[PDB]
Amino acid sequence: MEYSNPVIKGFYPDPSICRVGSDYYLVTSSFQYFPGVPIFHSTNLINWNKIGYCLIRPSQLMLNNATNRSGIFAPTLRYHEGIFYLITTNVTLKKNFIVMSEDLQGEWSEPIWIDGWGGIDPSLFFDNDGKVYITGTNDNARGEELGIYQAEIDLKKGSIIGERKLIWKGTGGSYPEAPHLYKVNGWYYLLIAEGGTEYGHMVTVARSKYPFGPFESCPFNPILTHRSTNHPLQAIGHADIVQYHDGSWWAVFHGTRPISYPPKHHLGRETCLAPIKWTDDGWPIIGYNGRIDIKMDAGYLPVKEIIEDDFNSDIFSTDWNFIQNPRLEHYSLKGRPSWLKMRGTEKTLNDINSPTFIGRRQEHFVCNVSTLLEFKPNQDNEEAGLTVYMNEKHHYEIALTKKNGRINVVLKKTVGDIQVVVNSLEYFSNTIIFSIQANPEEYKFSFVDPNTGQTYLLGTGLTTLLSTEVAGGFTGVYFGLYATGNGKVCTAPAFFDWFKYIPE
Template sequence: MTTLYNPLINGFHPDPSVVRVSEEGQDVWYLATSSFEYLPGIPIHRSRDFETWELVGHVATRQGQLGVESVRTAGGAWAPTIRHRDGVFHLVITDAMGRGMLHFTATDPAGRWSDGELILKQDGSGSLDGIDPDIAWDDDGTVYITFSGLILDGPDAGTHLGIQQVAVDLDRHVALEEPRSVWSGSGGQFPEAPHLYAVDGRWYLMIAEGGTERGHAVSIARGDSPRGPFETAPQNPLVSARSTIRPVQNTGHGDLVIGPDHDWLCVLLGVRPRSMTRAFSALGRETFVTPVRWQDDGWPAIAPVLLNPRPGTRVEVSFAEDRPLDGEWIAVRATPGSLADLTSRPGALVLHGRGTTLDDPRPVFVGRRQEHLTNSVTVRIDVSAGIGGLAVRYDERFHVEVEAGGGAVTARAVVGDLVQEWSAPLSSDVLLLHIDSVKPEAEAGFARTSDVFRLGATVDRARVELAEVDGRFLSSETCESFTGRVIGVYARSGDVAVESWTAEGNDE
């Protein structure tokens, strides 16, 4: 029997979409998630048993595939749908505030993916206005793009038109009609994340509604045609954690798939808040999974999402010229390879500062997603020729860091417009920097925050604790971010050499 781990994919991996294919007579599942302003974009995970997942590639690995180089924060790659037809993988997504609504293809989901074609309006005047596109084929081969009609640009920016649909000429990537309104849920705000499925001769339209925060939910309707009309399920919402104390909150944005042993499953996003009132979600939106049961009346029933974390992990990274960075490394509006120099100093990753800080939209920063609620990262760093350090980033306005160079080591917390620093003299240019995310102490049996950052440095084998920072200031609720925590190394000026990276964590 399959063990359903939750989270299914740890850390900042929201808006999951999954497809099942047969490879050499064996079922294989591929899962895509959003990446926003980070590159490489749109990670693809693979599993052969729905328990163990590996990152096999990304859709956007080349400049220009996504227009994120200058996209504003929280823009970029929003909500993919991945499907497979006639030996080809199809992925549709909105590059929000970037290129627009895009269609990518590949014969191998590990890559290489196409450059991405804009899905144009009927008059060819530009991209379809909307987010969260789904792609589905009728029995006669008609291609339908169903999407959430949120307008992001122009004078009508912010207007929401509900769930819309067009038939599309996929050879020319042009809509064959004006967008039509279809079923938009049971009255919750922000109807989004539509997915169409043909099951036992009926078409089911599943959407998210209620917003991607505590009111998030999954609802469904059905009809005899992918065009509708659609009948609302009597038990909507099918799944939601709103007004509960469940350890997994914000559950929604689901995608259905047949899992191992032909059991139906729903992958969806959620968060893991900690504190007395389950108020603060340190890691942002993650991917979860829950069983689905088809009832006698033809409607699906989706079980509540249960928490079942994996064992803790330890990751040690060393650097070599002949071994490129693995796919877990990401950067902000740039590829890690364009920032990380593995050739100028053997055994080190060198970052060349250019005067930017983490307050800037394009910092010299490469990092990895924080995957565990309790987490420690240590780097060995040489700042004899520059200034830089180790940081946890949500975005330009919310980050904490330990920075060394210029004769000092400094812990810094940036929370919106508030900045606080703690400094100590630095006696050596080669040192260890530490950022630990630890479980908060309970008061009268209740924790009052998500976690606590401990920021420190080890110089000449003596560890100096520089500061403690309340972790709630880097949670999705405080930052109001679509992303999550990314821990990485950065350079402000000169050359900063990172000699090793060690991360370990668990979810206790």
């Protein structure tokens, strides 16, 4: 039997996995998006269902001034004696913290702040003797030596027990990071990422008889990389190991699907899966001797997408994210039952701090995304529409606005410093359907006059100008509904009747 990589498509980086009985739970990084840290469930490691998010309250997730270069970085999920622990970094605060839960269907605790523990990629390991270890990277604010650091931790107080020690510098790649400590057959293994989360990404491993080392580098490191290859999956690493309940071993990790030349990616880093075998001399090998594929053999794993939101519910679906903490008064599912009402502010898609926007990830190269908007702008600055958004300097949008006292539908783009109105047509109806067809190379922007059903191709836009390589940061493209008054509060409300996401 076979599965396909990625196993979780779209913007789902830095996967960390946790087994409880015969069920599996998995978390990814979310940066400036709210709610933060999606969490998934699976019984077979291949098929994942999103259960929700871990960070859903402003007290858990302070995103003021966060951008797609900051906010929430890699999270690690662990379980001990009925309690789940989620440990991560808010890079905008430069703070590491834990939240806890005894029930993933409920909400998580308030943060337990780890005072004095810097760096990124914090991880926890519950040792068989009852000791608990925190492992992480060098602290850039203290200007520490590059490498992996560790201490015993008291999980109640959020405080270190004894001393913080350097345990490994890695093999010599850049940015030794993503550390996870495991104990298997009488050896401690330290699994890390090196080379940076771009084309030099690799996974390396070390071992010792003791939790703090000294650690010996695996003689065939790196144990997983696509560096110096032209494989369709690139930038592979940030692995976390799990033992399936049939006894076999697996890793989850992220990778990209770049297109064009030089390679460029716009769906973010996506969660992948590969098997592990243990050598006779006691080292793990991932995949086909350090390389993986799009199509994989499933071993003994038991093998087994149209999304339509009409906004009838008064709870938002788990697809939707906001840019930083939502200003809650500017969204309503109750003010006009069966529509989403949005109040645009002075802030635009060019601004980082709390623009009126709700969005969901592009999870497929080929897809058609649409919405129906009612909007009658009162002034020329006023605008509402549908956006393809990477970050504040990289986004395309089709929208209704007003220019010299006439209503127009527009295609607008922000690419770096370029802000351009690509096309403009006069429009005469109170509602409009926007419709975007995505393929690997371009987005086609159309609008429909709803009562006639007539469709009009307004323009197109390249995917590669929204790619992470061009745009910066650590994220993937979102499809978003938004409103703005372009420097003033938008006096007209925007109402969205529904949103459809139809992958090929």
